[PDB]
Amino acid sequence: LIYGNYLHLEKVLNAQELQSETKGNKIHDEHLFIITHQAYELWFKQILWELDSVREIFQNGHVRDERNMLKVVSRMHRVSVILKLLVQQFSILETMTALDFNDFREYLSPASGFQSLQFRLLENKIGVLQNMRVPYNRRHYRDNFKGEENELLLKSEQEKTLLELVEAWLERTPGLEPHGFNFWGKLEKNITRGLEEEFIRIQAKEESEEKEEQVAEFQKQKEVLLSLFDEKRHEHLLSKGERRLSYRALQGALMIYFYREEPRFQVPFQLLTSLMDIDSLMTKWRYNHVCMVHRMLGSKSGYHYLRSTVSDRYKVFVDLFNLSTYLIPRHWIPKMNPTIHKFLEH
Amino acid sequence: LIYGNYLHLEKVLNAQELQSETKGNKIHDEHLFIITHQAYELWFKQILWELDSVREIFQNGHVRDERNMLKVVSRMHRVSVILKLLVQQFSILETMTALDFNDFREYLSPASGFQSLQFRLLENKIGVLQNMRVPYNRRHYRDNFKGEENELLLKSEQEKTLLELVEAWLERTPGLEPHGFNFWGKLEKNITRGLEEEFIRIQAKEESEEKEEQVAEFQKQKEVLLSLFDEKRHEHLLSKGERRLSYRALQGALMIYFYREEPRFQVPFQLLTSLMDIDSLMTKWRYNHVCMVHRMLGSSGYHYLRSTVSDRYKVFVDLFNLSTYLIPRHWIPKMNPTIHKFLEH
Amino acid sequence: LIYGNYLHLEKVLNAQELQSETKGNKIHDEHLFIITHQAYELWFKQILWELDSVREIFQNGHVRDERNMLKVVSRMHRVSVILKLLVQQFSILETMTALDFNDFREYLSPASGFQSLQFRLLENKIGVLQNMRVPYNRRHYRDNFKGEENELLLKSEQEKTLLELVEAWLERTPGLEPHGFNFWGKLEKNITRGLEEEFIRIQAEESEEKEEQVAEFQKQKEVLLSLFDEKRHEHLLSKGERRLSYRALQGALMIYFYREEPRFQVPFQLLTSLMDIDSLMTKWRYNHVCMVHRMLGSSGYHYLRSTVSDRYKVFVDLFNLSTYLIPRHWIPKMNPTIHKFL
Amino acid sequence: LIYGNYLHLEKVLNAQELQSETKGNKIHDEHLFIITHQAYELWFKQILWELDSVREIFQNGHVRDERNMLKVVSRMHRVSVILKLLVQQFSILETMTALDFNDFREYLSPASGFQSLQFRLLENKIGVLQNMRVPYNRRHYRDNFKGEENELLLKSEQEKTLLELVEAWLERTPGLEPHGFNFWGKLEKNITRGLEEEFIRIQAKESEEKEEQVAEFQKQKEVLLSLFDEKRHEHLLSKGERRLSYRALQGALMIYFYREEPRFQVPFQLLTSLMDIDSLMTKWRYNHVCMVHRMLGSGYHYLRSTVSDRYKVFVDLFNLSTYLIPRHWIPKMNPTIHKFL
Ligand code: HEM
Ligand code: HEM
Ligand code: HEM
Ligand code: HEM
Ligand SMILES: Fc1ccc2c(-c3ccc4nnn(CCN5CCNCC5)c4c3)c[nH]c2c1
Ligand SMILES: Fc1ccc2c(-c3ccc4nnn(CCN5CCNCC5)c4c3)c[nH]c2c1
Ligand SMILES: Fc1ccc2c(-c3ccc4nnn(CCN5CCNCC5)c4c3)c[nH]c2c1
Ligand SMILES: Fc1ccc2c(-c3ccc4nnn(CCN5CCNCC5)c4c3)c[nH]c2c1
Ligand SMILES: C[C@](N)(Cc1c[nH]c2ccccc12)C(=O)O
Ligand SMILES: C[C@](N)(Cc1c[nH]c2ccccc12)C(=O)O
Ligand SMILES: C[C@](N)(Cc1c[nH]c2ccccc12)C(=O)O
Numbered sequence A: 001l002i003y004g005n006y007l008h009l010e011k012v013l014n015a016q017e018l019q020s021e022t023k024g025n026k027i028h029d030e031h032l033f034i035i036t037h038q039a040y041e042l043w044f045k046q047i048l049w050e051l052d053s054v055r056e057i058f059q060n061g062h063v064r065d066e067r068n069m070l071k072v073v074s075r076m077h078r079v080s081v082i083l084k085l086l087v088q089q090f091s092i093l094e095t096m097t098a099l100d101f102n103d104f105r106e107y108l109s110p111a112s113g114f115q116s117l118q119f120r121l122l123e124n125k126i127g128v129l130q131n132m133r134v135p136y137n138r139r140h141y142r143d144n145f146k147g148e149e150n151e152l153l154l155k156s157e158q159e160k161t162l163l164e165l166v167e168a169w170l171e172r173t174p175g176l177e178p179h180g181f182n183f184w185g186k187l188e189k190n191i192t193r194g195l196e197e198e199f200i201r202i203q204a205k206e207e208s209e210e211k212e213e214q215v216a217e218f219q220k221q222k223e224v225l226l227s228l229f230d231e232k233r234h235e236h237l238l239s240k241g242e243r244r245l246s247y248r249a250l251q252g253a254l255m256i257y258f259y260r261e262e263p264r265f266q267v268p269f270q271l272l273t274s275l276m277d278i279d280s281l282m283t284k285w286r287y288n289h290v291c292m293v294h295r296m297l298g299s300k301s302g303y304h305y306l307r308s309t310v311s312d313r314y315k316v317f318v319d320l321f322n323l324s325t326y327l328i329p330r331h332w333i334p335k336m337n338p339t340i341h342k343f344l345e346h
Numbered sequence B: 001l002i003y004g005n006y007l008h009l010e011k012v013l014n015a016q017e018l019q020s021e022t023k024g025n026k027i028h029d030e031h032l033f034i035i036t037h038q039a040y041e042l043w044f045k046q047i048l049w050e051l052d053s054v055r056e057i058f059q060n061g062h063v064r065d066e067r068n069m070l071k072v073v074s075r076m077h078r079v080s081v082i083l084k085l086l087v088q089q090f091s092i093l094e095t096m097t098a099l100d101f102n103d104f105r106e107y108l109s110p111a112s113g114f115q116s117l118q119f120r121l122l123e124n125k126i127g128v129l130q131n132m133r134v135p136y137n138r139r140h141y142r143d144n145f146k147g148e149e150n151e152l153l154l155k156s157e158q159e160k161t162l163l164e165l166v167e168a169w170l171e172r173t174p175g176l177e178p179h180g181f182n183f184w185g186k187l188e189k190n191i192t193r194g195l196e197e198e199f200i201r202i203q204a205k206e207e208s209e210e211k212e213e214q215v216a217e218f219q220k221q222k223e224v225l226l227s228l229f230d231e232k233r234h235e236h237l238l239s240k241g242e243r244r245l246s247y248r249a250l251q252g253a254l255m256i257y258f259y260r261e262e263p264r265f266q267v268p269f270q271l272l273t274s275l276m277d278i279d280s281l282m283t284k285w286r287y288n289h290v291c292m293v294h295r296m297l298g299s300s301g302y303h304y305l306r307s308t309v310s311d312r313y314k315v316f317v318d319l320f321n322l323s324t325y326l327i328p329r330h331w332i333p334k335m336n337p338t339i340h341k342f343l344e345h
Numbered sequence C: 001l002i003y004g005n006y007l008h009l010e011k012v013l014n015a016q017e018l019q020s021e022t023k024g025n026k027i028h029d030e031h032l033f034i035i036t037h038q039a040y041e042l043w044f045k046q047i048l049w050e051l052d053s054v055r056e057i058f059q060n061g062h063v064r065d066e067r068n069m070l071k072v073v074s075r076m077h078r079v080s081v082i083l084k085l086l087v088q089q090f091s092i093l094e095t096m097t098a099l100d101f102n103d104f105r106e107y108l109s110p111a112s113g114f115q116s117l118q119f120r121l122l123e124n125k126i127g128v129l130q131n132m133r134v135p136y137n138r139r140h141y142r143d144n145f146k147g148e149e150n151e152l153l154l155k156s157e158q159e160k161t162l163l164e165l166v167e168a169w170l171e172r173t174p175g176l177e178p179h180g181f182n183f184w185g186k187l188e189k190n191i192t193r194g195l196e197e198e199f200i201r202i203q204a205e206e207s208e209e210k211e212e213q214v215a216e217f218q219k220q221k222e223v224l225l226s227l228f229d230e231k232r233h234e235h236l237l238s239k240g241e242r243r244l245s246y247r248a249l250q251g252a253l254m255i256y257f258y259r260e261e262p263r264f265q266v267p268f269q270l271l272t273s274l275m276d277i278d279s280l281m282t283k284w285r286y287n288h289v290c291m292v293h294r295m296l297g298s299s300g301y302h303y304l305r306s307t308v309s310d311r312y313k314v315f316v317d318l319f320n321l322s323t324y325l326i327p328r329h330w331i332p333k334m335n336p337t338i339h340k341f342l
Numbered sequence D: 001l002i003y004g005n006y007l008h009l010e011k012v013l014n015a016q017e018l019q020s021e022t023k024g025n026k027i028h029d030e031h032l033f034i035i036t037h038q039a040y041e042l043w044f045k046q047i048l049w050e051l052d053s054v055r056e057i058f059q060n061g062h063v064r065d066e067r068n069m070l071k072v073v074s075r076m077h078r079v080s081v082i083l084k085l086l087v088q089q090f091s092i093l094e095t096m097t098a099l100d101f102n103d104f105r106e107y108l109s110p111a112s113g114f115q116s117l118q119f120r121l122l123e124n125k126i127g128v129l130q131n132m133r134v135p136y137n138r139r140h141y142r143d144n145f146k147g148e149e150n151e152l153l154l155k156s157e158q159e160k161t162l163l164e165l166v167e168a169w170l171e172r173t174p175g176l177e178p179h180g181f182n183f184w185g186k187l188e189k190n191i192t193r194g195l196e197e198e199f200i201r202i203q204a205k206e207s208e209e210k211e212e213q214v215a216e217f218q219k220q221k222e223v224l225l226s227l228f229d230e231k232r233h234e235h236l237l238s239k240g241e242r243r244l245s246y247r248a249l250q251g252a253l254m255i256y257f258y259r260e261e262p263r264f265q266v267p268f269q270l271l272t273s274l275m276d277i278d279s280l281m282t283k284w285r286y287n288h289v290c291m292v293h294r295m296l297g298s299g300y301h302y303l304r305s306t307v308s309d310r311y312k313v314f315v316d317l318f319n320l321s322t323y324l325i326p327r328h329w330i331p332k333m334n335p336t337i338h339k340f341l
């Protein structure tokens, strides 16, 4: 067993055919463009491998055994460490000038990155919605794909996504039981009370621009906080695709946020953090890719379509980010005395 | 022409065979170990491509046309930007624990990174000298290689290296002509004079320990500076492999250092800078690789690898060491436009 | 001379007062928020130092001596290396959760990053135009400032910007002389010819492929010939959608196309670095936005989002020269006979 | 409350005095040298803040409540994220050439980085031992310091270090009870047995490969059984080739092997981050060395000496890789017997 055989370098290092050279006009920088993409694809394959393994742990019920949370968080962390490198890797392609790219661009048409099967598979498996995908020149993405490739794409759309598997798991989060710790009920009450207290305070002040300013802020804060308990408004925002998680999953997430220090919630909290990281880094990748298309082609547009992809429309875990909106004073958080805490001890 | 076909992904993405899985005991993290190395190898191929192209520009005489310096510096800069990423890429493999590596390590024997053809090609093409290589288990690196692989490795040793091609170019550096600007002559004189000036200054100082200290410093500095003009000392240090550039090439390098702002030397100065960067980053790569072997295998190969993290493997150590011979600006032989013109484009 | 004294650490390391602690409720992570910003400010001061030195080299005429180009490009490169680090530095503040930030946010009012004098000075000195700024809360940015600070900000708007100083230098680029190499004239002719030649080719099959190629030719011709429309340029200048004078634009394109010619090698690197600085400034604004979102939720967020736009790209014209790339063989030939001038 | 006042920028941004300018020969690049160091010092202060807060959580007994492990690991992770940036920050000073540094170097004498109080405080608070310090010609690293500065340095050496506080905590790791899961006993037995089983295998082999395997076996056997030699450990402790008590070492290995068990998941991450901090500290030392070399040529060798295991405080955690065994040799922890975890 030799290194080169183990790594099948007979394949990996015999995969560089410059179209410029095939058409009798070799252009040096084409080689860089080929290798950069091959490297992106190697790492996309590794991301798919980690992500598929984590999806499986959820789908098959292994995640139910909390012994497996360390593995889940390590692999999701690994996904983000890979993505950070993928973002840095753009700096290599920045060493190619547009004038140099212009010397071989002709020999590439009509190929495009759009045809990256694995990038699409990755978007789908995380949880990007087709309905929300931005049309490129009034066209569907899968239009450019055929055969078994079109097949794999379909499975990726139809199989349970990371978002859905996390949703299901969040729905079973301990503490939501109305007959138990009754998190949601206690939270509603504590916030309603606290708002009442606060209003009384402000109402006791004397008419002024200040008082109005405080009253106005209060009203805004009140509306945001109480909207959390409006299950119907949530259902509505779900159907418009401005939210992604079920109402119950949202309750589980908030439970984990507020009780993160409780032992059973420590690693779950880290998982939520890494899911947000993955969304952020995916968006950073899209951003750096856009900046590059611009530098090479100008405003001539793919640039604008790609710019549209840099939006909340492509953020699968938007709901986890938006739990910042619902931050309250610590003393309003339902108290969990050891009496009612033992259920969250390893 | 479709993306996947253009990039031959039918090969690149059908090259991942976990030996753990082939022997009926798939271990998840083996997949990462394979991909990481495949990625290193893709980028080694790219470095070889740039490096070979720059070597050719020198070997074929194209570098004589100063129009080509921009291309040479961009490609060498590109080599160092790739190497920066190769160093960061270790952080991916740091997400694998030793315990998890231990579950598939058995299925890897007897394969090793040592058998990386391209890493050897890269060391050779830059200019690592065989005689200065540290033996691993009392053997040449080029054993463990056979057939056309052994062939490629030979060519890489026998063809002109980047070190040799740079040396040749440095020897032709403008300004070294005794009949012209006579840089070396003027430099020797100006330093001899400046040292004299300095001695007088210190000798004037009131008897005091500071004076005593400064006397000591002066003596050391004087010895270092004058040793520059000792061509025989240089020949000796060449034999011991503590220097690699010819005496004349060293003169050319120092010319470019001191006159870097002069238009014809601006991009050449950047080239020298990038050559040092490449050596720095190669040794950072070796260092990070060692730290990783340690974390996975504990404290043999470790010690061999530790020996690789040394000036013995820095091809352009001479460019770094020109810091030793820095002088006050006012000692640098003057180049008024009168004697400037030869360095304007 | 001792390290601590040389670096005036008696000041730098006695500058951390947690407002949470001053009001009797110390919150651990406030310390990090203070240090992060102090570090950003140290680096902004260094950027200002390099940038002011480069502006001086232009304004005083030193740049006319081409021996100074290495210094100019090194310092501009150094600006972008600093900015790369400023972008990475956000990852430190990402270790603070929103819940933890929430515990000391109250004690910060009414202070904001908006009030960073140095950040504004930097925007102004590069060449961000006030009239092109996005209003904050329906008002001008400088209204948030007072006294000598408001005055410094004005000088920064009125004194020559890096954009203006580069523009002047670009205007004197060798080769534009109609009586000389006549770059613009030759270029117009060669593109007119080359377009025709393309037509002749495309004139010959009737497939959609042909139709597609014909379609491309149309815009390509439109884009390329629009380059020679000086009036359209003047119009886009007044709307602020371009920044450089028509002549400066000619100089830049001269440098792009002839970058390998010795006199243009380091100038080409300067143009590259100016684009880098714009790109990295934008990356900084982007990462800052992503972080405000993570800490505050969904709004300054929307104002900040508006700053991530071409409106704030001072050297947009250098980026846009990609639009006007032609085949190499169309580029006016400069044989050594004439190449000697460069 | 205004930004500049909140951040006391009247101090931070009025702290840049170029000695080149003070002596009538301003050198542009000196400004960068000053700011770079000031930035390093701001971040060293932040590292000290996090590290001191973590040391407190151990010393005051809060670490006993496992609810606090998330905070402990977050702050140690934060230390590493800062150090990663400190390593990247060298790339800024690499934009200064040695020729340009040479134009103001004279005006610095005799000041040196050696005089960084905070860097010393950081080394000490982690657990770098004075007795293990590499002498700089005349030793006396603390002798470069005086006054309340010399005072602070002393406290930093004498107060409990991160190493010592972690050691104490590792000693209380659940599972080491002889009357309980009896980790050490079971481990010794399982390895002794497994080695015997291996002997039979190699015995049944029948040329060279056998020779190869037998040789390896002997080495592996020696390494593994040396783990159970408490006296050898005590000896290596007194030399300074190990740092953790024998019992702490047992706790660490418990956490390594049972990392997936819920009570050990975050503790395992803590051990990982302690190793990370050691790694990154030594990366910092390495990049600093490479730069002194580029600027001065030939402290290079002294600084090179600092890049050694001699300066790795958590060397014991790294070295537990040496004692990896097959998974099936690890004492089994059935639900019944992992209830405690
Ligand atoms: C010279 C550098 C690059 C240029 C000029 C470029 C150009 C483009 C353009 C114009 C598009 C929009 C679709 C189209 O018009 O055909 C696009 C999309 C895409 N490119 Fe690139 N690209 C570059 C580098 C890369 C790299 C390094 C990757 C890495 C795999 C990549 C992957 C993609 C992907 C996946 C898409 C589809 C993204 C989406 O639809 O959201 N490209 N590229
Ligand atoms: C788990 C991670 C790794 C381990 C444990 C490891 C182990 C080793 C060891 C022990 C050696 C010395 C030769 C021997 O006895 O086998 C070696 C050398 C080498 N490794 Fe690695 N390695 C790792 C990762 C990598 C990676 C990511 C690369 C990337 C290509 C690589 C490339 C090499 C090369 C080229 C050599 C020969 C270097 C020289 O002779 O100076 N290794 N490795
Ligand atoms: C918790 C972290 C941060 C939050 C929540 C935050 C929040 C904000 C907000 C809301 C604004 C809009 C103005 C306002 O309404 O106050 C703003 C602007 C700004 N922040 Fe931050 N910021 C953070 C970190 C930073 C840091 C680390 C810097 C570093 C110097 C910074 C510099 C600025 C600057 C310069 C502006 C003005 C930007 C412009 O107008 O284009 N901020 N920030
Ligand atoms: C031009 C760049 C630098 C040079 C030439 C330089 C030079 C040196 C030298 C020669 C030493 C050994 C002690 C001595 O002989 O004085 C040293 C130690 C030290 N330097 Fe630097 N240094 C540089 C940059 C930095 C930076 C950026 C830091 C960041 C704070 C720093 C912090 C230190 C520290 C803490 C030590 C003592 C560490 C130890 O003893 O292991 N230096 N430096
Ligand atoms: F393997 C690859 C191959 C090509 C690319 C590109 C890319 C970037 C800029 C381009 N300008 N023209 N073309 C030709 C393609 N036509 C433009 C619109 N889309 C399809 C028709 C381009 C292709 C980006 N990544 C690639 C990967
Ligand atoms: F494609 C690959 C495959 C394997 C590696 C290794 C590597 C790392 C640690 C190891 N421990 N045992 N073995 C296997 C046997 N070795 C033979 C050479 N002398 C050391 C023992 C190892 C192989 C590093 N890079 C690789 C790349
Ligand atoms: F040195 C510093 C000090 C503070 C900050 C902030 C920041 C971040 C979030 C905030 N939420 N409320 N406030 C108070 C500011 N008022 C409301 C928002 N508009 C301005 C008036 C905030 C201030 C960001 N960077 C800072 C740096
Ligand atoms: F705030 C600061 C000030 C200075 C430094 C240095 C530094 C780097 C190179 C030097 N060469 N000579 N000197 C003067 C000091 N003498 C030689 C070295 N040992 C002590 C006597 C130097 C000082 C590094 N970091 C610094 C920080
Ligand atoms: C038994 C369980 N693992 C419980 C569970 C669900 N979601 C959680 C989030 C945090 C902590 C625990 C849970 C399961 O049902 O998967
Ligand atoms: C014409 C030339 N390339 C001169 C030359 C050689 N080395 C240099 C370094 C810097 C500047 C110029 C040169 C030659 O003789 O090859
Ligand atoms: C003499 C000159 N340096 C000419 C000049 C202007 N812009 C340029 C761009 C590239 C090369 C040269 C120039 C000057 O007038 O500044």
Ligand SMILES: C[C@](N)(Cc1c[nH]c2ccccc12)C(=O)O
Binding pocket: D063, D064, D065, D066, D169, D170, D171, D172, D173, D174, D263, D264, D267
């Ligand atoms: C009660 C205890 N937290 C026990 C303890 C010590 N070390 C550990 C490691 C992992 C898990 C638990 C421990 C204490 O006394 O610290």
